[PDB]
Amino acid sequence: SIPFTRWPEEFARRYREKGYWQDLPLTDILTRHAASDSIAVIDGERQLSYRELNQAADNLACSLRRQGIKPGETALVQLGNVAELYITFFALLKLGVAPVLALFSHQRSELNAYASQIEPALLIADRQHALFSGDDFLNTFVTEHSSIRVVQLLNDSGEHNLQDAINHPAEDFTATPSPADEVAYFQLSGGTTGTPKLIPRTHNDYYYSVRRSVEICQFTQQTRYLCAIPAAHNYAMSSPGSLGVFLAGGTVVLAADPSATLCFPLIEKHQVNVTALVPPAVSLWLQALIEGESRAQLASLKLLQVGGARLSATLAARIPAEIGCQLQQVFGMAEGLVNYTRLDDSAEKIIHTQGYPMCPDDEVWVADAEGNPLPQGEVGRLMTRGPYTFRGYYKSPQHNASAFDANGFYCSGDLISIDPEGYITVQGREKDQINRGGEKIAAEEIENLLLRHPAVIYAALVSMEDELMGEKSCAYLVVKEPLRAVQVRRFLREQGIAEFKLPDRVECVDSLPLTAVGKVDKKQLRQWLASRASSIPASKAALREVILPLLDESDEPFDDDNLIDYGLDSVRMMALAARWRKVHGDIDFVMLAKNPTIDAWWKLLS
Amino acid sequence: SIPFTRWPEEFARRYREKGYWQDLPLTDILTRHAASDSIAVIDGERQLSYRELNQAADNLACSLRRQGIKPGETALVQLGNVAELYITFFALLKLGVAPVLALFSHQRSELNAYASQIEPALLIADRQHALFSGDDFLNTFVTEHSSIRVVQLLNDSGEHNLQDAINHPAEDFTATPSPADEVAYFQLSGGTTGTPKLIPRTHNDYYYSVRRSVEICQFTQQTRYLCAIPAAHNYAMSSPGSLGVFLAGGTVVLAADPSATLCFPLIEKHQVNVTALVPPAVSLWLQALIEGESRAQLASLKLLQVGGARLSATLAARIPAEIGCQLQQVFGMAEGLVNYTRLDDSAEKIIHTQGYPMCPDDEVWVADAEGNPLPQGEVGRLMTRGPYTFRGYYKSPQHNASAFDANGFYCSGDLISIDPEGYITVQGREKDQINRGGEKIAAEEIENLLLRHPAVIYAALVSMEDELMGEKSCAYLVVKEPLRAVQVRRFLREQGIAEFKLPDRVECVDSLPLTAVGKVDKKQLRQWLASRASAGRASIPASKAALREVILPLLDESDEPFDDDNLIDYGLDSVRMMALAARWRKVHGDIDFVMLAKNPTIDAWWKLLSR
Ligand SMILES: *P(=O)(O)OCC(C)(C)[C@@H](O)C(=O)NCCC(=O)NCCS[C@H](CS(=O)(=O)NC[C@H]1O[C@@H](n2cnc3c(N)ncnc32)[C@H](O)[C@@H]1O)c1ccccc1O
Ligand SMILES: *P(=O)(O)OCC(C)(C)[C@@H](O)C(=O)NCCC(=O)NCCS[C@H](CS(=O)(=O)NC[C@H]1O[C@@H](n2cnc3c(N)ncnc32)[C@H](O)[C@@H]1O)c1ccccc1O
């Protein structure tokens, strides 16, 4: 029925024979516990039993059937980190419908994009979301995508109230999930491409993803999991994420964001033993502790998952040191292929590598530029196929052609290298995609918006280092009439895109490399940047800038003044000597101190 | 004979009977090796055998005897980290003369001070030192201390050349060291007082200090020691320091300063296995490694001594981690009493404690304010007597009265606490003394110089925190006509004092606490400051322009926002925002991330902080 790329007959056989595809519905995850009175979800003050959760799902599905939603249809769901998300998810699974779980941070243009490829018969959104405070964008939206028939809204005492359908009990309704080898729902790809590109996941492949993730991370009835990153992403969903907790009878604790202020209290209060984060939030947490939060509220936490973005060995090491729990690096994509470091792994592999695939039948090779297998120390493009990795994007034949080699191996656009032990390390990136706090940003998607501006001739979006976010977006523009970053960010916001897509820096420049096709050449530009970057002071005035912080803030010296009289201490001086010796190697401590004036030291750095 | 406070007869007996005092001259350290051809000292490109070192000393001593220096007299020596220091020391020991080894950093006022108490018959200095470049200060100096008869200078091509006397061989010459229980030389306390106070050390007590230090640190002929901190201080001299290396037949490698740039090459080139540092140099070294120095030049180094100043457990732990050798904390004073952590000690004790005394007969207690002993966990003033700890300062009866209780126990002015295991931890300080990179600075000595200035009415010197130096001097003044730090540092410099005594910060204030006696009660001064400062640590933006100052660095440098603009349009990212919310919640506890971001303008956030 729904049109996805299937697996070669031969693979569908090996995957069932090898036990990976159990041909069970994803609903079976919540169904197992249908009779349990233990707590599945804690959202704020509310707590739901598995019985209640599964019941709510039956109700909402029943109520939706009554509103004339037929199996085979698609939906568009935008819900935040709130229980109604998990309810809606299972309700839609029980009906036979395939939703797209949209990020709550998404906006006008993203939602439009999704609804156009999906042709949704159902819309579920939240009135606390800016687009849904009023019914105007709402009304405009339903008319523009005509397929939409039913609409339910969270936080609405009004007509379309979602809670009404959730609490209206069940009829002669029985579940009708789609077949195990038929599409279950759609996941969102981390953008490489301007038109948003969806990922179909069948009950079979997705369920394996979750089961095997539970085995590896040791989730059990005991697991109390804090889900503070966006709940709708594949990571906090399947890896093992909240669904993995549900399969195992554990407890999911939802939180609106991952702020130490919000989370710390919840981890102690609910005795949380595991949680998943992205590197920027780990930085935030470690610092919040140093800034006087009590390392003791976090004492119940025995496991910290970190993934979605490059995690430095420096930062990884700080986790068990300052927080005092075990680290597991998770490297996965919405398309398939999650790599974990194991819990019984050595501290060497856990701090330095990204681990290895969750499946023995996950195939990974390292590829060179023409497409050739490299040995195992060598760096190249990551290729993989497998039992939970998909065979192509939904209704996107154009892109599918470039994303898969002739053998069905997907390419993530990641540069990796493999250990002699078989562990993967993320070396770099062969894609134009920016990874910002672990939110993917498609460079071309944003360039195309920039080109909608009258004064923009050529546009290029590249990543750039940030100690905290880990990467930030920087837009390089060639302009008719000069443009200021504010105006760009403002212009783009008016285009109705997610707030984190707005560039963190904008640099107008005299020219940009153009390739035969008309787009800026990213390889090039990336080179004539990273070169300029890789350093000791330029102007005598640049040397003053370096010295001043080392003296008494109280006064400023004349270039010929003795800097000791200004409070510069011999140790800071020795260091300055060391830093400058790496350029003029005759400079030592003694030489600097023999005549310590700015004049003297400038004559030396000449 | 020279006038020092002796040990009670009962103790001199126990200390000989227990083997501590061997009644041998300190020269015996160099004498043992007089026939050895192995290398005692490497100074730059020069290398001296024990035979040569001992010989040079016999020559310089003989040459000095010829110039009329009689046993019993005193000297003033100012020499840096160079071999001629060690030669001069033993030369003067062989004559029977007791020198003061002055720091090379010392200047006009310090040297005057020393020569006044000592009444030196002999002056030995270096022409590379600013005061001795020319003959100007030297002439003024000898007239103004008339006791001085002979003068020898390092790097003097002229008549006073020291090298000449060092190389002029020995006539009929025998050493006439002073008797083991008589004074050998003088050491400098950093001093708690404004007149410099000298510490007499007898051959007996000082030699013990060295022997027992060698045993504990296991120096042997294999020990190859880099002496980069000032060579004349008790630490790099006796603990075990260069003399400990000489006793053991090891090799001492001299270096002018302890910079990673100078030292790293020397440790590799000479295969140095041990060296002593102060906490600020350890920071400098650890960072130099991170900044791209190869951890491999330091590979021969099996032991790193760190002392002289508080060494944080964070820093201590980094040593074996990043440098990869063993740490030994050393907490001694020039007056006696060195505490080591042992080499076989646990990593717990080595990182957290300062170790315990090098002698079983070292006595340590702790005292509340009455002088009564505190129980075996409590914090209080450190009291000690012992076989190598002196019984009083040289010709300073006034101070001696306050530095010793009636039982002969010296008080270091340190606040310590003792482990159930008996290990000492330095808790804090009483003495009004500033410890700057581990150079002691007497607060009163500097105050009295500040009062020499016309515009200064009341003066107070206190310590202050510094991440790197560990402590810096800050001078609080009450002034007639307003003074700027530069003018103070310059004024003080002209007073002829060591460069590190110049205050790192100067604050002019409207008033200072004065006690019934007339000088700043530094005790209130210390609290008025305690609070002003700990009120501003949890401090949050004062006013709306102070809040702008905090936000701007978080946005694009490119533009500035109007108070009502949305700050996200200016590049402020949700993570930094969460953090700002956290810091502000500690004052208004209703503030979370969500609230900040609902309306992220400077106006909005100001309305929230004025509540
Ligand atoms: P403000 O904006 O309010 O807040 C900032 C903050 C807190 C960071 C906020 O943005 C936030 O909450 N962020 C969370 C980000 C997040 O939830 N990320 C989940 C990503 S879902 C991911 C699949 S993917 O396709 O989107 N990513 C695939 C690509 O990601 C790269 N990548 C993944 N893991 C990596 C590791 N470990 N190292 C290096 N790169 C990594 C890679 O390039 C890949 O192609 C996902 C993550 C984990 C497991 C499974 C999946 O599917
Ligand atoms: P620029 O100025 O060119 O360079 C800066 C730099 C490198 C810091 C420079 O000044 C420098 O080289 N400094 C080295 C200082 C130094 O050599 N110090 C040795 C001093 S001799 C010391 C005994 S004392 O009487 O001088 N001081 C005694 C007091 O010291 C405190 N204290 C000692 N040890 C301590 C430890 N381990 N922890 C905490 N406090 C400590 C205490 O207040 C005591 O009363 C000495 C030190 C070690 C061993 C033996 C002796 O004699």
Curated annotation (Swiss-Prot), chain A:
Signal peptide bounds: none
EC numbers: 6.3.2.14, 6.2.1.71
InterPro entries reported in the protein's UniProt record: AMP-bd_C, AMP-bd_C_sf, AMP-binding_CS, AMP-dep_synth/lig_dom, ANL_N_sf, ATP-dep_AMP-bd_enzyme, DHB_AMP_lig
A family per Pfam: AMP-binding
Coiled-coil segments: none
Domain of life: Bacteria
Subunit and interaction comment: Proteins EntB, EntD, EntE, and EntF form a multienzyme complex called enterobactin synthase. Monomer. EntA and EntE interact together.
Function: Involved in the biosynthesis of the siderophore enterobactin (enterochelin), which is a macrocyclic trimeric lactone of N-(2,3-dihydroxybenzoyl)-serine. The serine trilactone serves as a scaffolding for the three catechol functionalities that provide hexadentate coordination for the tightly ligated iron(2+) atoms. EntE processes via a two-step adenylation-ligation reaction (bi-uni-uni-bi ping-pong mechanism).
Miscellaneous comment as given in the Swiss-Prot or TrEMBL entry: In the absence of holo-EntB, EntE can transfer the adenylate moiety of the 2,3-dihydroxybenzoyl-AMP intermediate to ATP, generating the stress signaling molecule Ap4A involved in the regulation of cell division during oxidative stress, and releasing 2,3-dihydroxybenzoate. It seems that the expression of EntE during iron starvation produces Ap(4)A to slow growth until intracellular iron stores can be restored.
Protein name in the entry: Enterobactin synthase component E
Species of the source: Escherichia coli (strain K12)
